[PDB]
């Protein structure tokens, strides 16, 4: 059959029974850094079972009048196990990911979701002179959420969360140029993405630079008749792939 899968990494296993295919990045699978492209000249560390496993973030509730959520990707796993400890003691590091968003409902519910994974999502402030604060651009394993109305400009430091512009000043229907899948509750149950390492330098610092962003926004809202179960959650699991670090120093 085609609708069944199984993903095994480390000591974790993910099984699905209703699914589409796997979207693989820009056509490329993640892999370690070659000896032609490296610049740091001391040996990296590769734990390879301790960090490359499935980490489950916090669930959120899909209400009827909801707008969307986002996560910043090398920041959500900053306090998750031995991935979060290697990010502190090391100065560099490159990583690819495997993202598996899962949301199930019955044959009597309706809905649709768009699961994109955008690189370099620089977001805009609400006041036109300033830039947003760090605690409102991201959060450890917590979803920052869009709004169906426009943030008032008299606020001091906020992110503009008008959903139809996606926070970056762009038409939100044009977001399908990035690698993406749809969760359609008529036919689908989950969405899987495999993303390689996309950056303009071969290695980068992992605390000052968030180089991926996962956006989940409902194009067709959730609806059901009275008598069905009203609580529908969404759960995101992210597993690093081929991670390696360099330049050991103090904790921070």
């Amino acid at each position, epitope marked *: 059959s085609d609708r069944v899968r199984s993903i095994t990494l480390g000591n974790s296993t993910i099984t699905t029974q209703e699914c589409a295919n796997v979207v693989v990045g820009y056509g490329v699978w993640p892999e370690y850094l070659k000896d032609n492209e490296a610049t740091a000249e001391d040996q990296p560390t590769q734990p390879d079972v301790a960090t490359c496993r499935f980490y489950t973030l*916090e*669930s*959120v*509730q899909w*209400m*009827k009048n909801s707008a969307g959520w986002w996560w910043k990707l090398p920041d959500a796993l900053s306090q998750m196990g031995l991935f979060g400890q290697n990010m502190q003691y090391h100065y560099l590091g490159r990583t690819g990911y495997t993202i598996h968003v899962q949301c199930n409902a019955s044959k009597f519910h309706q809905g649709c979701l768009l699961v994109v994974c955008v690189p370099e999502a620089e977001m805009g402030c609400s006041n036109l002179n300033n830039t947003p*604060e760090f*605690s*409102e651009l991201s*959060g450890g394993d*917590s979803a920052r*959420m869009f*709004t169906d109305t426009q943030v*008032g400009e*008299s*606020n*001091a*430091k*906020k992110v503009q969360t008008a959903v139809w512009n996606a926070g970056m000043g762009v038409g939100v229907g044009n977001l399908t140029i990035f690698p993406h899948q749809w969760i359609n509750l008529r036919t689908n149950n989950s969405a899987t993405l495999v993303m390689p390492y996309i950056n303009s330098v071969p290695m980068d610092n992992m605390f000052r630079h968030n180089n991926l962003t996962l956006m989940i926004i409902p194009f067709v809202p959730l609806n059901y008749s*009275e008598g069905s*179960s*009203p*609580y529908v*959650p969404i759960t995101v699991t992210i597993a690093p792939m081929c991670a390696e670090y360099n330049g050991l120093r103090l904790a921070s």
Partner: antibody
Amino acid sequence: EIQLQQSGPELVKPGASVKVSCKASGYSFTDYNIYWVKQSHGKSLEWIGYVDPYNGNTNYNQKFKGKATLTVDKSSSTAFMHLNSLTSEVSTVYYCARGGGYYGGGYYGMDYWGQGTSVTVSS
Amino acid sequence: QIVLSQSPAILSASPGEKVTMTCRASSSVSYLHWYQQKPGSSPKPWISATSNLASGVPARFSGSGSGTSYSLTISRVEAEDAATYYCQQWSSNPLSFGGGTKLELK
């Protein structure tokens, strides 16, 4: 509009019981939880518990575990709360609020409160 | 168990200045909301999930902070907010409340 409407204030005797109400109208009743808090005449707020109207799973505080019981009636979209063993320190007011589903979906918080019934304990 | 240590006990300010009111928790919480109760009325939902201003709230109110330290800040004190302000958490620990700092005009 979304409106939550409660009953009128009563008085009871020590050792008695009283059932308060919170009628919800203006929206679909089984979609959201209903939280119950109390406000003392001089102190801050305290949480009693909540109830899910879809299946009736009641959760409670550790202080009010045996002295309060919440129930629901889906056919009329009202919520009830039964208070056991009324005491001396409960010259307070009881509120009902509409929530989201408790930490899966509390991002709007407790977004629609009621008027509040004030009960007294006297002879 | 989460205890919300809302500080100070009481605040006072002349009309037309900037005030700051803080709340610190025992650990990290998922959400944080603030309410306003005028004495003799039900508490109204003010600023929710640490930043978002509610419906009908004037734009002179602000809230920020993360980690374990939160705050609420009125930019210019107008005359129609002589009330008390409570603070609520929504973590996996059951529920808590702040303690109600009172704001009256000097």
